[PDB]
Amino acid sequence: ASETFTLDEESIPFVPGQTVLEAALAAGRYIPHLCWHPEMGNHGSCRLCVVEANGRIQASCALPAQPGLQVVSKSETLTRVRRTLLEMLFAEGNHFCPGCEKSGDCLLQALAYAHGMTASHFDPFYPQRRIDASHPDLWLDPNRCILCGLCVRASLAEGKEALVIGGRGIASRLLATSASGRLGDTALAATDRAARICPVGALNFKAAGFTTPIGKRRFDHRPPEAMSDKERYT
């Protein structure tokens, strides 16, 4: 760690060229994020990581650390902009947490609690995508999927290439790369890194739900800031 930059009036060490997000988290200084992940690196879709620098707002997962770069991660504007993004993602899908088997074990939800989100102030989109329960060990509710793309990246990296995001605009959805469009016809296996990496309730194991008592779930009274990287990340 040769160089340093300023994150909220603090000298923060950095290996060039880590991004700001990478360097901050290495130093134990949390910044809201969703689509970033230690193994699969950045992506740039969620936008929760945004920060003020040069002298505009931009994603800290793409912002490269420079020596003596001046960075604000905590302001009223930044907390509002994030709150808003959290309302967009909730509005966009069917996040009925009360019957979701990732309630209390879900990053989107935990981020929402941490930004004191009370309700998404937008008209719901009530999308109408089909569940895919074709795989023997796995199932996919696509109305919960936030298009983080971790499942995709994970699968490219381990060679299975099972998934892909297709469509344009609000039609954008997660798709299986099989000719039939069915997860069961791809090479995806329950042992694959991709199988367990979804941070919300979209892609799940079959019949492994509601096994954890309320009170003892991954995020139960632990915001993302309070967690180690073991537990924070899928």
Binding site: F90, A91, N94, H95, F96, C97, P98, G99, C100, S103, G104, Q109, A112, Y113, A114, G116, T118, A119, S120, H121, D123, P124, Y126, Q128, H221, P223
Partner: protein, 178 residues
């Protein structure tokens, strides 16, 4: 003058009202400080006018709309309580299906029905809407209490706050959507 509270259940399960009653003996202290208009707990058949309306449940049918509007006009502060009223809740999973196809599944096609069974027609019954909607899609909402249901501790904190004039604050440890 004592404050007036109306309460209502639209496409709810009554669960938010039970979480309200989960304040336990504190309801005796609440009884001293407030007065209840229309509410499933009281006999008043017609709403209003009051300082606070607690609404649980989504809007699922025509009579929910007429009632929601009534409560809106009658009440200064209208509050969307529970997941149902907030984003449509688990009942809103029916927006995955065609409402005709549902009613027909339940009242005509079901293998355990008597021969001749038909979807109920009578004007005394209110028609279901095409989709379930949160209350905010129909009227303006002043506050949301999340949870399915909200904790009694939230419901209490919320009221406690409004009675004293203060602005509702929900600590992280009282917040849930599930």
């Amino acid at each position: 003058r004592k404050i007036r509270i109306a309460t209502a259940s639209l496409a709810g399960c009554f669960g938010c009202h039970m979480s309200f009653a989960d304040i336990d003996t504190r309801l005796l202290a609440l009884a001293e400080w407030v007065t209840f208009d229309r509410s499933p707990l009281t006999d008043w058949k017609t709403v209003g006018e009051c300082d606070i309306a607690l609404i649980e449940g989504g809007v699922c049918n025509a009579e929910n709309v007429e009632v929601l509007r009534a409560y809106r006009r009658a009440a200064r502060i209208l509050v969307a309580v529970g997941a149902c009223a907030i984003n449509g809740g688990l009942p809103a999973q029916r927006n995955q299906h065609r409402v005709e196809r549902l009613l027909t599944q339940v009242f005509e096609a079901d293998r355990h029905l008597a021969p001749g069974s038909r979807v109920p027609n009578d004007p005394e019954l209110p028609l279901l809407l095409e989709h379930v909607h949160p209350i905010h899609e129909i009227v303006r909402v002043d506050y949301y209490l999340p949870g399915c249901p909200p904790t009694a501790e939230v419901i209490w904190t919320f009221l406690t706050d409004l009675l004293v004039g203060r602005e509702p604050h929900f600590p992280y440890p009282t917040l849930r959507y599930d």
